[PDB]
Amino acid sequence: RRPARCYRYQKNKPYPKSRYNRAVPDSKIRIYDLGKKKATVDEFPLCVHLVSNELEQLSSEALEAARICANKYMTTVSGRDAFHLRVRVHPFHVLRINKQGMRGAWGKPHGLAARVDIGQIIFSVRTKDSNKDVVVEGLRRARYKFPGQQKIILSKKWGFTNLDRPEYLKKREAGEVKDDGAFVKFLSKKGSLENNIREFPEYFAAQA
Amino acid sequence: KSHGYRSRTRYMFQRDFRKHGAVHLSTYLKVYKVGDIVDIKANGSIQKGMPHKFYQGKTGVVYNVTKSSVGVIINKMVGNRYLEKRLNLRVEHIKHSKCRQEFLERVKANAAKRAEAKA
RNA sequence: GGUUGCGGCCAUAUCUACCAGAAAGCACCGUUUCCCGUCCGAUCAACUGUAGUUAAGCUGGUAAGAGCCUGACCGAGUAGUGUAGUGGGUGACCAUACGCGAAACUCAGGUGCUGCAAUCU
RNA sequence: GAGAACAGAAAUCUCCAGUAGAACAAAAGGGUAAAAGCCCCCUUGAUUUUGAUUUUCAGUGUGAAUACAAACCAUGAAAGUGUGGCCUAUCGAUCCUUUAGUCCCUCGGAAUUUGAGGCUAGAGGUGCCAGAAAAGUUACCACAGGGAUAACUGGCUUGUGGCAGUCAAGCGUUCAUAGCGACAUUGCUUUUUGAUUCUUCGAUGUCGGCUCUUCCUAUCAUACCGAAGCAGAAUUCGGUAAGCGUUGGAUUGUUCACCCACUAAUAGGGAACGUGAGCUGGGUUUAGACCGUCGUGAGACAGGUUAGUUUUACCCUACUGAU
RNA sequence: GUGAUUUCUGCCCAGUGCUCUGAAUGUCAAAGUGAAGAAAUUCAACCAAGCGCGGGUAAACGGCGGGAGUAACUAUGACUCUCUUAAGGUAGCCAAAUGCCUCGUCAUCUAAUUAGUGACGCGCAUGAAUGGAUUAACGAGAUUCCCACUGUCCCUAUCUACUAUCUAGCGAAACCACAGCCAAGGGAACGGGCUUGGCAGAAUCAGCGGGGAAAGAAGACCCUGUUGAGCUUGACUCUAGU
RNA sequence: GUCGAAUUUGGGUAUAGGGGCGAAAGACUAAUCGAACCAUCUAGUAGCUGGUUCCUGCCGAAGUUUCCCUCAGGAUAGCAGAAGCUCGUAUCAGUUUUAUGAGGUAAAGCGAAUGAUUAGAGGUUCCGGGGUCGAAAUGACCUUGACCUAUUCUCAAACUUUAAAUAUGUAAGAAGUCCUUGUUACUUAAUUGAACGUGGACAUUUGAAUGAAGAGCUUUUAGUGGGCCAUUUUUGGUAAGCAGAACUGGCGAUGCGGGAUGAACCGAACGUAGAGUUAAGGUGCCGGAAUACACGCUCAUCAGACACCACAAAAGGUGUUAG
Lengths: 208, 119
What we know:
Chain A is α+β, with helices and mostly antiparallel strands. In chain A, 22% of the residues lie in helices and 12% in strands. Chain A is built from four helices and seven strands; from the N terminus they run ββαββββαβαα. Chain A has a three-stranded antiparallel beta sheet, with helices on one face. The radius of gyration of chain A is 23 Å and the shape is elongated. The relative contact order of chain A is 0.19. Chain B has two helices and no strands. Chain B has helices at residues 25-28, 102-118. Chain B is elongated. The chains are: A alpha+beta, B mainly alpha. The chains hardly touch. Chain B binds four RNA strands through helix 2. Chain A: Belongs to the universal ribosomal protein uL16 family.
């Protein structure tokens, strides 16, 4: 393009170049999950994620190539049922270029990249146990692409994945989300229903 | 880029949070004192009781009380030498202070005579 | 207990949905002859003394629930920052020393509610 | 959510039940809900005199704005409020001239009027807005200074040029890597070019050639080797390698470029873009003179064309030699 | 003013200039006249030129357009439509000493041509006494060829005089902080002088053109300066003259 | 080149300075000409160059503020020096401490405002492009968009509730409270207060700390106004030994020891001397200092660089080392 010299740093706060910088040469990575979407949220568990340790500007196109070769293998040896490669960086900051033959010039937008805080998660995906090395070996690919970088880390949660939370979701065997307070139980938790609960329910609210 | 008289003020002369309008009719009662120490604090509702920028945050002492709403004054002084300038602010913008050690002037003196008889 | 003029914070200050309301007080409500008022229209405005009502309004309780709380514990001694080095690393950055030191997240007890003057059963 | 006839997405009309999402001339921000918005009602405070204040961290006048005093009004039933447009922008010294002011002050031998002059409050212009009244050209030219300031060397930097490199989707009919590689990404290079203004106008003379060494290797040829989609040959890729070579003529001032030939090859590149105290002077960049093209003129063209003064070495060093 | 002859003088008078009795009328100064005050003085009317109006004028300065359609494969314009300022380049003439792109395209001359020459034309931007096109002869004028000739050259070599050189006599100038050997470093970014390292022997001769960022004429190029001076108009400001 | 004709040339004569003469070049006019020569005005002018003369001793800077046809000058502040006043713990401070204010930037935040952006879910939802019993007000379901609704993903100089650190206002023990009353223009209806003043009780004072070579004050009149470095925080720019801001040091004005080498690095501030320790840096040898003492790691260029032209990445190793 113009190389990666308008590359990873700062030299300019953060020109997210919206309302104020109208002409943002449109993005590069209008993808983000590209994989076995509409997933089970059970099923494709144990997620391995790709963390970047280096306050940089993982460029625009670059994130693309990521996706490219990302899916390439993801699928090419595991299937459209196997992936779900959550983008998880994402590319603001419109950088610029230069061009009365040397007298005071601001940049005209010139490609949008994104700030990988050293520790942040990048193009990180999630899949079932029997996909381990599958996924793993693959993400390697990227690290080799994209101004690296690299965690290729194996994880848990929360529950963006399996995901340890292992003992957790493996514990919320019984339920899903709230929980929360205790009142209008319209999340069929089982089993009677309302009556009993609404007994115990105020049976304590009353204890105050 | 320009230097008008409210310049930069966008957040100083701010407002509120939720108290985003109308003078607390208390902040309007209360009586001055040709001597008591006031503490500027501008409030966009008003607008003489807007204190032209610099004198923001700055606490001084009432020298004028044109009590017809016309708040008092005080001055303060500023940089190079301190040439003390006086500003006629308005009753809705200024506020009391922490001369609240006269509470300990009292505490002192009194407890100190009760100390006379005590000693 | 209400009612009048109130201070307050005025989401640390309402919603929303159901109830329940003795006594008084306000309300709703009757009525157009005047004062007065309709971009039309006695709704509103105001103007005159009890036929009928608590149904609303209001007041308070229920949700725990939506709001902000108020506190504390993980969160957190982090995140960020004051100073220091002839510290580390190509670099990016980063660590260590003393010092300050959050915010979001959640767990709890609150619920809008104090209280001023004068009345009043 | 209701009622529609030119309406029927609606342009516009009337009903009803909840985020301040609207509106405040004009930019943007502040602000503003019985309002600071909108409909009505009544006025002219956008008033006189001053002074004080605030606004450059502010000691300078200016404009603007804040609170008072004294008057004189508006408006409300009032308490109030109103000294211009909710706040932050929207303006102007010095002589001169005009005007509004008491009907006040003097023309100096006295008067009278006419006129002139004064005092205080304004308009008339200064935008370079702290306020000169102002056309070009010089290539025929000139002066004082500027490395404070540009052409050139050097200098950083390297985007831009050039050159290698990783990943492997692809070509390569069968196969990613023999030979190549999209995307994406790491770099080296200082014979491009571009930035920059540090050095040198209080002396540095341009381009090209001619000559003459000397270095680099990112090797065109020659030496030995490794792979090839290597049968032979003929090619390609790569390693050790800078020892040694790397030509002659048209056309242009040419660098360059483009041919004609040759040969093993007819590689690239540094030394102040090597090389006038070493030519040459063709170009470039004085005065002379054509044209075109702009200009009224003078002249002016990084347009084309022609004619135009290249001074000095005995000294020091360096060398080739020499006592 | 233009430049022998020879031929050839296209069209533009609106612009700027020039210039005529001209225009039925509008400005237009001084004196002179009228009106008003008590005058000073301030209002008036008429008023030479000039101006402005009218005409001629280009061998006077100078000028000389632009876009749309538009059959009998194809591209095409004598066609018309147009908007348009005086007029809308006429004869003639070229990559020409004017042509931008351009090293124009085709020939031609070469083994070879950014040269030549001959052609061709919406020629950046040729053109008619701003003179247009020709043209015998003339030319220390510019170009390109051919023949002859030739050390220009391939490829250099040898010979003569004079000078270098060495002696006697005669005897200067330039220049000159102090000096004078290198390599890297840093340095006001090309040190002789400094740092580290190479090294490093008196005293001199002839040559030489790397170096002394060497030498003379306070640098031909640029800018700054409240610095000039020569030319120049429809810039100010005036003046001889008329 | 020309060489009998516009020939060549002597003498004599004529034209003299904005004037001459000129087959026109800006030519020539006594080596002088885009305005001769001589003298005088005249030491012309100079915001620019150059130099500016004898010692030591003290104090000791500016490049920045504002207004100028100022851009190299000048005014104006600010820095200095001198001269001195007035009187002796008054009170002073580039300082912390307690009490009390002021901040919106770091951070944080979008199942919060705004404005961006992921992704599917649920509508018992509406305007249409595909189909269906389908087919001209087809009821009814239907596939993509079209707005909710509880969710998801990631962002903000010129967005946001929340909101630091640093820095930034004040206050302090104490002239202070506490008590008594008295003055009239003030406004309260006034025994209403306001402002001022008399008489009266207690101060050396029982959190503030810490520092004082007093303190205050007046005149005057130099230089300066071209600044440059660093660390952090930043603006532009691929970048810069680039250009621009912000604190704090610093260089310019400075030596001294480290960094070989050198304005801004580190240590460290200079009267003249003796002795002693040390900073930073160093101790094989130049060169003072151990070829000291320990546990490992590294073997064709492996290296030996706190700031710097001081350089070196992505990628990869069955080298060897621990995990």
